[PDB]
C-alpha cells in the first residue's frame, strides 16, 4: 500500500486506503535472510563410521566441536533444491525440490503434456524441451526474492578473527554451512585438506560500515556461501525492483496534476540510503498491459461491462451535477437512476473497448408514416439523445429513421445499393452503407423532399464537434494505445469550467443540439402532411409541449461541456484499468473507425491468418444498447445544488479516490504482466521449431513440434506459475491460452478505418528483468543438467562382466562403439524382428530395411526401442545379456537414477536393469538406472558383478565429492573437492561479483545483502478554495 | 584506509572578516551547531519538487556556501595546530563536533583573521590519532576545497577506466535505479562522510562510476539510446521539473570503454548553479569520490580565480596536472537536447522547442540570483549568493570543449 | 570532410556562427580525411621498412605509428563556421597543429 | 509544506514559491477558509509571538 | 556515384572557395557556403560502369550526384 492516510486540509478527516475481479497488487516484495542458494551438498551414501581421531578443538579445558561445514561421507552429490537454506518470513508457493540422483527425479519433469497418461514413474521424453523450461521457470520464480541483510557478529575464531560474519538466527545450524573456512580443525580429510586452502579474507563480509542510517547499514556485502545462479537470479530481481521504483518525492506532482489543481497535497518523506517504493511502471510497460486487458476482455461484452459500470458508479458518485425531472414534468405537465445517462459518459471514458449504441426498439419501424404521432415523437427522442451516445453511426442511423418515417411525402432516392429509403434504420451499420445524399445534403432537393434536405442539412451542421484535453501526469506514462499520450478524446467542444452566468449554459455545444433540433422538429409537427392525421388543438399541444423541453433550462448541457471533462479527465488517472480510447470522428466517412481487434502477431509474420474475434461483432467495440427515451430525460434536467463552489466541491469528491493506492496497482500489475509476457512468449516461442526469435539455449533437448493447441498448454503452465508466484487477480496473462494462437510474437492493436486505413499501435514489451534471467538460468541447465538429474549423451548396454572398477557416469573406456562406424547397424523404424521358418535364428530388421541378424551391435534411436519395448526385451535383449550383442540406445538427454552398491557384494545387474525396460512404452520411459560402486575406504577384495548400462559422455560432474571424512580412498570412484566449485573462496584472483554462469555454477560467491525500507506516504490535502 | 587531506579556506571577496556572523552557528539544521555531516540535512525529508529556500537562504547552494566561510573561520587546527576561537566561538574538544560558545577558566587563543589559509592536515598530530571518530570533518573539509578553488561553480573530477565496468560494481549499482540525481548526491555524500572507507571499496568505484555516467547524460551522450553499461538518466520536460533525472536501466546499445584515461576535473562558470538543485547535487555527488581518494592529479592553473593560483597540493601549473573543463548549464542543456535529435529521440521540431522552454527556465534562475545579490549584498555581514556580478550569466566557456570530452569518454 | 575542426561557442543552439575554430593548448585541430592518411601513412611506412637498420645503429626509437600524432574529437568540421556546420563529424581523428609539427 | 531537522515550516506563498512564516502576510479570505486547520496551527501561534 | 576520393576533390575545390567567405559577403557576391552536400543524394542499388559489373557492388544510400548536378 503505497498511500495509507490523507487527513484533507478542509475538512480535516483521515481517507485511509481501502465478471472481472478487483484487481489486487503483485506480491513485489519477498525476503530471507537464509544463504542465498538452491544447490546444496546432500551427501548421498553415508559414511562407514571412521574412528574420528582429532576431535574439536580444545579451549583451556573445553573442546570445542564444529560442525563440518561439507556433507562428508561414502558419496556427496550436487543435489538441487530451491530455497533449501531459506531462513525468511515467507517464500512464494513454488519451488523445485529434486530428490538426490538415487531417487526417481522423473515427478519434477512432468508439467506440460506429460499429466495424464505418463505412468507416475516415467517422464515423456518427447516433451522435455518444454518440460524443463517449465521446470526452470519454477526454479526462477521460486528464487524471485530480497537478501535482507540480517545481522553480523564479529569473528572471534583465530584465522578468521576480525572477520564479521552474519548472526542466524532462525536456525543456528547455518552458520557452519555459511561460512565454509571459518575454523577448520586440522583433521587432513579430502573435505578438511581442502577446506585449508581457503583465504582467511574471503570469509565474512567485505566492505567496511557503508551507509549506515541509524546504526544498521544500508547494505553490506556479506560473502557466505551462494551458487552463482541463484545469486545472479536475485541480482536479477533486485534490479526488476528498483527499475520499477518511484521517486516518493515526485508523488506530491502525480497527485497535483492527475487531479488537475482541484486536489493539491504534500506527502514529506524522509529520503534515506535505501528507500523502495515499486509503483512506478512506464507508458512503454502500460501499453503491454492496455493490449493486454484487450486480449482478456475480447469478444466477451460481459467482461467490458464491468469495467464502463465501475466508471458509471464513480462518474456519478462524483459529479456536482443531479439529474431531477421535476422541473421539467412541472413545465411539460401544464400544457398536457439515469444509468442510460451515466452508462454514456462512462462509455466514452472507453469508446473503442464498448461503443454505445441506441436500442433498436427506439427506431419508428420503417413502414410506419411520419402522420402516426407516436412515431415522429419516438423519433424526436431519438434525436434529442443521438450525440449523446459512442457509435461512430449514430449521425446516419437518426437521419435515417426521419428519412424512413416520412418515405412518401418525401420520396428521396438512397444511394447504398441494395437499400431504400425504407430500409430499417438501425441496418445502417458501416461507413459504406452511408447515403451518399447525406453525405452531401445538396443531393437532396429543397422542394422534393423539404424536411429531409433540410434534416440532413441540420446535422450536416449540429452534431457536436468532437474535441479532446489532456489528463493524469506526465511523469505518469501514457498507457493509452490510439489516441496521443496521457490525453483523451472527448465527443463534445470542452471548455475551462468557467464562471456560471447566462451565458455558459445556453451556448453549450449541447444546449445549441437540444436546441436547434428541437426546433426543427417544431416544423416537422407542424407540416401541412401532418394534417392527415394530426388535430389542429393537438398539432399545437405537440408545438407546445416540445417547446417546453427546448426552453426547459436545463443545466446538463453545460456539465457535459465545462465540468464533465474535469471529472473525466481526473476519474480516467485514478482507475486500476486506464481508459482505452479509439478516436471519434463526426461525418468524416472514410476513416470512421470500421473494426478494432488485438493481433498476436502482425498479419505480414502471422501464417495460419486468424483474425481477432472481436471482427465477428457489428460495431467495433461491445455494442451496449442505451435507450434514448431515457438519455433524452437526464439530459433535459440537470440542476446542480444551490451553493455550490466548484473548487470545493470536485475537492472533497476526488479526496477518497487518491486514498486509495489504486492508482499504483495499476502500475504494479502491468511490470508484472510485462514479464509474465515476455517470459510467456518465449517459452512457447522456444518450443516450436519457427516462430520468434529468442535465445534458445535449450534447443538441443528433444522436443516435438508444439502446435497451437499444445502451445495453449505450455502456456497455461507459465501464465498459472506467475500468478502462483505473485498471487495476482483475474486474468492477467491467460487471456492468451484461452483462444487464438497461444503461439504470440509481439502484441499489436490496430483499427482500421472505412477509408481503407489500419493504424496499428504495435506493443514491444521492454526488457523483461525476469525472463533476462531465466535465460541466463537455461543457458546455465546446459553445462549443468546433472545437477538435476537430467543426463546428456546416448546410453550403451554393451554386457561387462568386470569384477574390477566400474563408473556408468564418466566412463573412462573408450566408446563401445560409435554410430556410424564399422558393422553397427542402425535398427529401423518400428525394429521388427522377424521370426525365421526351420533351424535359422530370429533376426531384427534393420533400418536399410533389408532383415539384419541380432548377434552384433545396434544403434537403437530411443524412439524405436519405445514403440517395440516387448519385440527388445524378448529377443535382443537376451542377446546382450549373453555377451553377444551390444545394444546402444539414442536419447539426447533423460533423467537418470543411480543406486549405489557394495564393491564387495557380487550381483548381476540385469534384474535392476529390466525392472527399467518394463516400464519404458511409447508414452514414456523411466528414469535410465545405472549402479555405482560405492567407494570403499580400506583396500577391500571386491566381488564379481556384471553390468549392462553406461553413458557416452561424462555424467558424473553431479558428484560432489567422495570421502570427505578421509584421508583418501582405497577403491570406489575418488572424487577429491574440485577448488573449480569455489573460485571465490580458494583462488587467490577471485573478483568480487564474478560469476562464471554460462558454464560452470560457482558455490562460494559474493552476494549483496540489502536492507530496503518501505517508505509508505499519508499527507495532507488542501482543496483549490473557491477563489 | 586514508588521512592526509589538503584544504584550503574560502576567500573573503575583499571583505573585512569571514562572511557570516553569530546567528548562523544556531541555525544550520540536523545537529546543533555541528557543521559536518551537514549540508543534505534541509533535504532530509522530502515534501515535493519545489527547491528548499528560506529567507535568509535565497538558494539551493545557499545552505552550502554559508557552511562554507563558517566552516573555514574556524579551522586553525590542520593549519596552525591550535583550536584558537573566532567571535567568541570554539569546538566542544579535540574531536572537534559542535561549536560552543568559548568555555571559561582555559579559554582558547582568538584566531588570527586571514584570508585563503593553507589546510595541511598532519599539522593537527590528534586527527590520525584519532580517525574513525573524526572522519567526516576529512570529506566535509574537502568539499571546502573543491568550492574554494572556484569563484564560479564546484570544481569535481570525473574519470572512466579504459576497460569496462568491474563485475562487482555493476552488481551495486542495480540498486539506485528510481533515483532522481538529487537524492543520489543525498546517498553518496552520506556515505563517504561516517566512516572510514577505503580507496579500493566496491561502493567507492560505483559511486564515481555512478557521476561519470551521470555527466555523459548531462551532456546528451549517454541517452535512452546509448548506455555507458546499461544505466544512463532519462530528462523530462524543462518545462515541468528538468531536475529529475533518476538512473534508469535498459538493455539497448552500449557505447565502448575509450582508448585512454579521460581523467579531466569539470566547473559551471555560469552562477546558475547556485540555484539549481541538480548541479549542486552533480557537483557534490563526485566530491564524495575525491574524499576518500584524494585528487587523482593536481588542478589546471589555466583560468580560476584569482586567489587558487599556484595552491601547495591542490593546483599547480606543470605537466602533473589536468585540464579543468568548465561548462555553462544553458548551452549545456541546448546541446544536450542537440544529442537526442541527432539519433532520433525528439523530432526536429522538439529540438528548438526545449531549448525555449529550458532557456526561459534557466531565466527564471537568473531573473532570482541577481534579484536576491542586491536584496544581500556582501558587505552587509554573510554571503549566502556569491558576488557573482550581472556581467556574466551567458559567456559560456569552454562549454564546447567539455561536451567533446563526454564524446570521447563514450566511445 | 576537411579543414580545421570547430565546436559550438557560447550560449546559443548549434548555428553559423554559434561555430568557433576550437583552438587550445595544442593548436587547431585539423580534421584528417581519409586520402591525407594514405599519405602519412604512405610516408611513415617507406620509413618503418628501415626498421632492422634503426636498431642495428641505435638511432630511431622504435615503428612510428601515424596513431601517435592523432586524436579522436568530435564536432563540426569545416573551413568557415559556415560550412563547417554542415559536416558533423563524430570521433574523428584530427592531427593538432602542435603535432602536425612532429 | 514542512522542513526536516528544524527548519521553519514554509507557507506556499502566491506565487508558488513556498516562504516563510515568520514575515507580513496577506490571506485571500476564501484560502483562509478552505484552509483554518492550518493557519491556526502554524501560522496563528506565529502571531501571537 | 561519388566514390571516396572524388569527394576528396569537390571538398578540396569547395574548401578553397568557402576560405574566401569574408570577401564575398563584403561585397554582396557569392550566396552563401558552397556545401557539396548540396549537390548529392542518398540512392541505393548496384553502381558499376555496365550491368554485368554492376552486379557486384551492391551500395545502400551511398552518395551519388545526379547529372544535371554535376553540372551545377
Known amino acids: 500500500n503505497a498511500i495509507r492516510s490523507f487527513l484533507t486540509a478542509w475538512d480535516d478527516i483521515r481517507i485511509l486506503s481501502p465478471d472481472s475481479a478487483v484487481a489486487n497488487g503483485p506480491e513485489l516484495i519477498i525476503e530471507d535472510t537464509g544463504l542465498c542458494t538452491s544447490f546444496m551438498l546432500l551427501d548421498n551414501i553415508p559414511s562407514a563410521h571412521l574412528t574420528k581421531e582429532l576431535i574439536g578443538f580444545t579451549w583451556f579445558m573445553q573442546m570445542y566441536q564444529m560442525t563440518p561445514p561439507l556433507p562428508e561421507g561414502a558419496v556427496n552429490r550436487i543435489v538441487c533444491m530451491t530455497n533449501w537454506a531459506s531462513l525468511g518470513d515467507e517464500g512464494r508457493g513454488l519451488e523445485v525440490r529434486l530428490p538426490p540422483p538415487t531417487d526417481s527425479s522423473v515427478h519434477a519433469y512432468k508439467t506440460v503434456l506429460s499429466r495424464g497418461y505418463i505412468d507416475n514413474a516415467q517422464f515423456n521424453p518427447l516433451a522435455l524441451r518444454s518440460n524443463v523450461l517449465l521446470m526452470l521457470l519454477q526454479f526462477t520464480l521460486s528464487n524471485l526474492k530480497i537478501n535482507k541483510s540480517s545481522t553480523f557478529t564479529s569473528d572471534v575464531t583465530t584465522i578468521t578473527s576480525g572477520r564479521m560474519i552474519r548472526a542466524f538466527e532462525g536456525r543456528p545450524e547455518l552458520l557452519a554451512l555459511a561460512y565454509p573456512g571459518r575454523a577448520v580443525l586440522p583433521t587432513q580429510t579430502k573435505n578438511a585438506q581442502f577446506l585449508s586452502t581457503a583465504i582467511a579474507d574471503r570469509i565474512g563480509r567485505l566492505d567496511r560500515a557503508n551507509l549506515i542510517g541509524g546504526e544498521v547499514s544500508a547494505m553490506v556485502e556479506c560473502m557466505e556461501l551462494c551458487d552463482a545462479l541463484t545469486l545472479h537470479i536475485r541480482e536479477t530481481y533486485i534490479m526488476l525492483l528498483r527499475s520499477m521504483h518511484q521517486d516518493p518525492t515526485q508523488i506530491v506532482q502525480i497527485v497535483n496534476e492527475c487531479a488537475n489543481n482541484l486536489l493539491n497535497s504534500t506527502i514529506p518523506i524522509s529520503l534515506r540510503p535505501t528507500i523502495l517504493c515499486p509503483w512506478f511502471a512506464s507508458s512503454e510497460d502500460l501499453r503491454l498491459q492496455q493490449v493486454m486487458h484487450l486480449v482478456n476482455i475480447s469478444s466477451n461484452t460481459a467482461a467490458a461491462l464491468p469495467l464502463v459500470e465501475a466508471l458509471s458508479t464513480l462518474l456519478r458518485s462524483v459529479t456536482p451535477l443531479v439529474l431531477d425531472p421535476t422541473v421539467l414534468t412541472n413545465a411539460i405537465t401544464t400544457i398536457s437512476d439515469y444509468a442510460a445517462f451515466w452508462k454514456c459518459i462512462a462509455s466514452w471514458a472507453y469508446n473503442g473497448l464498448v461503443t454505445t449504441v441506441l436500442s433498436e426498439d427506439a427506431f419508428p419501424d420503417s413502414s410506419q408514416s411520419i402522420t402516426h404521432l407516436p412515431s415522429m415523437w419516438k423519433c424526436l427522442f431519438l434525436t434529442l439523445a443521438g450525440p449523446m451516445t459512442s457509435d461512430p453511426h449514430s449521425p446516419v442511423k437518426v437521419f435515417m429513421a426521419l428519412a424512413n418515417l416520412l418515405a412518401q411525402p418525401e420520396p428521396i432516392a438512397i444511394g447504398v445499393p441494395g437499400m431504400h429509403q425504407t430500409t430499417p434504420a438501425s441496418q445502417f451499420s458501416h461507413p459504406g452503407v452511408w447515403p451518399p445524399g447525406f453525405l452531401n445534403p445538396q443531393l437532396i432537393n429543397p422542394q422534393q423532399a423539404p424536411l429531409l434536405r433540410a434534416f440532413a442539412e441540420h446535422i450536416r451542421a449540429n452534431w457536436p464537434q468532437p474535441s479532446e484535453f489532456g489528463y493524469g501526469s506526465t511523469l505518469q506514462g501514457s498507457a493509452n494505445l490510439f489516441i496521443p499520450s496521457n490525453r483523451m478524446v472527448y465527443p463534445w467542444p470542452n471548455q475551462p469550467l468557467p464562471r456560471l452566468t447566462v451565458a455558459p449554459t445556453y451556448d453549450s455545444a449541447m444546449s445549441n443540439w437540444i436546441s436547434t433540433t428541437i426546433a426543427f422538429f417544431i416544423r416537422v409537427v407542424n407540416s401541412v402532411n401532418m394534417t392527415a392525421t394530426v388535430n389542429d388543438l393537438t398539432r399545437r399541444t405537440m408545438t407546445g409541449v416540445m417547446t417546453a423541453m427546448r426552453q426547459v433550462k436545463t443545466m446538463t448541457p453545460f456539465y457535459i461541456q465545462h465540468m464533465c471533462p474535469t471529472e473525466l479527465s481526473v476519474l480516467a488517472s485514478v482507475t486500476v484499468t486506464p481508459p482505452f480510447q479509439v478516436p471519434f470522428t463526426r461525418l468524416v466517412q472514410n476513416d470512421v473507425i470500421t473494426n478494432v481487434l488485438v493481433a498476436r502477431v502482425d498479419p505480414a509474420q502471422r501464417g495460419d491468418a486468424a483474425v481477432d474475434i472481436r471482427a465477428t461483432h457489428a460495431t467495433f467495440a461491445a455494442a451496449l444498447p442505451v435507450d434514448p427515451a431515457a438519455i433524452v430525460v437526464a439530459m433535459l434536467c440537470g440542476q446542480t445544488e444551490t451553493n455550490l463552489i466548484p473548487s470545493h466541491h470536485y475537492g472533497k469528491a476526488f479526496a477518497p479516490l487518491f486514498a486509495s493506492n489504486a492508482m499504483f496497482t495499476r502500475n504494479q500489475r502491468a511490470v508484472i504482466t510485462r514479464e509474465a509476457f515476455v517470459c510467456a512468449r518465449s517459452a512457447v516461442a522456444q518450443c516450436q521449431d519457427a516462430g520468434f526469435l529468442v535465445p534458445r539455449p535449450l534447443d538441443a533437448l528433444r522436443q516435438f513440434d508444439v502446435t497451437s493447441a499444445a502451445a495453449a498448454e505450455i502456456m497455461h503452465a507459465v501464465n498459472d506459475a506467475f500468478k502462483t508466484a505473485f498471487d495476482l487477480d483475474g486474468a492477467l496473462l491467460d487471456g492468451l491460452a484461452l483462444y487464438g494462437d497461444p503461439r504470440i510474437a509481439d502484441l499489436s492493436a490496430a483499427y482500421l478505418q472505412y477509408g481503407g486505413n489500419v493504424v496499428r499501435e504495435h506493443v514491444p514489451p521492454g526488457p523483461s528483468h525476469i525472463h533476462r534471467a531465466l535465460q541466463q538460468v537455461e543457458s546455465t541447465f546446459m553445462a549443468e543438467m546433472n545437477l538435476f538429474n537430467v543426463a546428456r549423451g546416448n546410453l550403451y548396454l554393451v554386457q561387462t562382466a568386470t569384477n574390477g572398477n566400474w563408473s556408468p557416469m564418466a566412463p573412462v573406456a573408450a566408446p563401445p562403439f560409435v554410430r556410424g562406424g564399422p558393422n553397427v547397424r542402425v535398427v529401423g523404424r518400428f525394429g521388427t524382428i522377424v521370426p525365421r521358418p526351420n533351424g535359422l535364428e530370429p533376426q531384427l530388421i534393420d533400418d536399410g530395411n533389408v532383415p539384419r541378424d541380432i548377434a552384433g551391435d545396434w544403434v537403437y534411436p530411443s524412439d524405436v526401442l519405445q514403440v517395440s519395448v516387448a519385440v527388445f526385451r524378448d529377443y535382443v535383449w537376451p542377446m546382450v545379456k549373453a555377451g553377444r550383442t551390444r545394444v546402444l540406445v539414442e536419447l539426447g538427454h533423460y533423467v537418470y537414477t543411480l543406486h549405489y552398491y557394495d564393491p564387495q557384494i557380487s550381483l548381476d545387474e540385469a534384474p535392476i536393469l529390466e525392472e527399467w525396460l518394463s516400464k519404458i512404452n511409447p508414452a514414456g520411459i523411466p528414469p535410465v538406472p545405472f549402479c555405482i560402486p560405492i567407494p570403499q575406504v580400506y583396500p577391500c577384495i571386491t566381488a564379481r558383478r556384471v553390468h549392462y548400462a553406461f553413458t557416452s559422455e561424462n555424467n558424473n560432474d553431479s558428484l560432489f565429492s567422495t570421502n570427505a571424512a578421509s584421508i583418501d580412498t582405497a577403491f570406489g570412484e575418488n572424487a577429491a573437492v574440485s577448488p573449480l566449485r569455489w573460485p571465490g573462496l580458494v583462488d587467490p584472483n577471485y573478483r568480487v561479483g564474478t560469476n562464471d554462469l554460462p558454464n560452470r555454477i560457482t558455490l562460494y560467491n559474493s552476494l549483496y545483502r540489502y536492507n530496503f525500507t518501505y517508505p509508505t506516504l499519508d499527507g495532507i490535502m488542501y482543496v483549490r478554495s473557491a477563489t | ?411 | 570532410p576537411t579543414g580545421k575542426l570547430w565546436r559550438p561557442v557560447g550560449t546559443s543552439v548549434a548555428t553559423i556562427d554559434s561555430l568557433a575554430i576550437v583552438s587550445d593548448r595544442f593548436g587547431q585541430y585539423s580534421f584528417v580525411n581519409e586520402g591525407m592518411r594514405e599519405t602519412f601513412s604512405k610516408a611513415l611506412f617507406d620509413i618503418n621498412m628501415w626498421q632492422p637498420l634503426f636498431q642495428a645503429t641505435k638511432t630511431g626509437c622504435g615503428p612510428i605509428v601515424l596513431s601517435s600524432f592523432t586524436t579522436t574529437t568530435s564536432g563540426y568540421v569545416g573551413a568557415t563556421a559556415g560550412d563547417a556546420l554542415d559536416n558533423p563529424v563524430t570521433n574523428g581523428v584530427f592531427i593538432s597543429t602542435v603535432q602536425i609539427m612532429n
Request: charged share 10%.
Open chain 2, 1 to 411: 584506509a586514508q588521512r592526509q587531506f589538503f584544504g584550503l579556506t574560502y576567500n573573503f571577496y575583499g571583505q573585512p572578516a569571514p562572511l557570516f556572523d553569530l546567528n548562523d552557528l544556531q541555525e544550520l539544521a540536523g545537529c546543533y551547531a555541528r557543521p559536518w555531516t551537514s549540508r543534505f540535512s534541509h533535504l532530509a525529508i522530502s515534501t515535493g519538487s519545489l527547491p528548499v529556500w528560506s529567507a535568509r537562504y535565497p538558494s539551493v547552494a545557499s545552505r552550502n556556501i554559508v557552511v562554507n566561510t563558517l566552516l573555514g573561520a574556524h579551522l586553525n587546527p590542520f593549519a596552525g595546530g591550535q583550536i584558537t576561537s573566532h567571535q567568541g566561538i570554539t569546538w566542544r574538544d579535540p574531536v572537534l563536533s559542535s561549536l560552543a560558545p568559548v568555555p571559561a577558566i582555559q579559554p582558547p587563543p582568538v584566531w588570527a583573521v586571514a584570508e585563503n589559509v593553507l589546510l595541511d592536515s598532519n599539522n593537527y598530530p590528534t586527527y590520525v590519532l584519532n580517525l574513525s571518530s573524526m572522519w567526516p570533518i576529512n570529506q566535509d573539509v574537502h568539499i571546502m576545497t573543491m568550492w574554494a578553488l572556484s569563484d564560479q561553480g564546484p570544481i569535481y573530477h570525473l574519470e572512466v577506466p579504459v576497460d569496462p565496468m568491474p563485475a562487482a560494481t555493476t552488481a551495486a549499482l542495480m540498486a539506485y535505479t528510481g533515483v532522481p540525481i538529487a537524492h543520489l548526491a543525498q546517498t553518496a555524500y552520506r556515505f563517504a562522510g561516517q566512516l572510514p572507507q577505503s580507496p579500493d571499496s566496491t561502493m567507492v568505484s560505483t559511486i564515481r562510476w555512478l557521476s561519470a555516467i551521470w555527466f555523459g547524460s548531462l551532456t546528451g551522450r549517454l541517452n535512452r539510446s546509448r548506455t555507458c553499461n546499461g544505466f544512463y538518466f532519462e530528462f523530462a520536460k524543462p518545462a515541468l521539473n528538468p531536475d529529475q533525472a533518476v538512473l534508469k536501466w535498459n538493455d539497448g546499445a552500449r557505447a565502448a570503454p575509450p582508448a585512454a584515461a579521460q581523467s579531466s576535473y569539470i566547473r559551471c562558470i555560469s552562477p546558475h548553479w547556485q540555484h539549481q538543485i541538480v548541479e549542486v547535487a552533480g557537483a557534490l555527488m563526485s566530491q564524495s569520490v575525491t574524499a576518500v581518494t584524494g585528487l587523482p592529479a593536481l588542478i589546471d592553473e589555466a583560468t580560476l580565480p584569482a586567489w587558487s593560483q599556484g595552491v601547495a597540493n591542490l593546483t599547480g601549473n606543470g605537466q602533473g596536472v589536468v585540464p579543468c573543463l568548465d561548462y555553462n548549464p544553458v548551452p549545456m542543456a541546448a546541446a544536450r537536447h542537440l544529442q537526442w535529435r541527432q539519433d532520433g529521440l525528439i523530432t526536429a521540431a522538439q529540438e528548438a522547442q526545449l531549448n525555449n522552454d529550458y532557456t526561459a527556465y534557466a531565466l527564471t534562475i537568473e531573473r532570482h540570483l541577481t534579484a536576491m545579490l542586491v536584496a544581500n549584498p556582501i558587505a552587509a555581514g554573510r554571503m549566502p549568493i556569491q558576488p557573482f556580478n550581472a556581467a556574466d550569466f551567458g559567456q559560456a566557456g569552454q562549454t564546447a570543449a567539455a561536451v567533446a570530452l563526454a564524446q570521447a569518454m563514450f566511445v
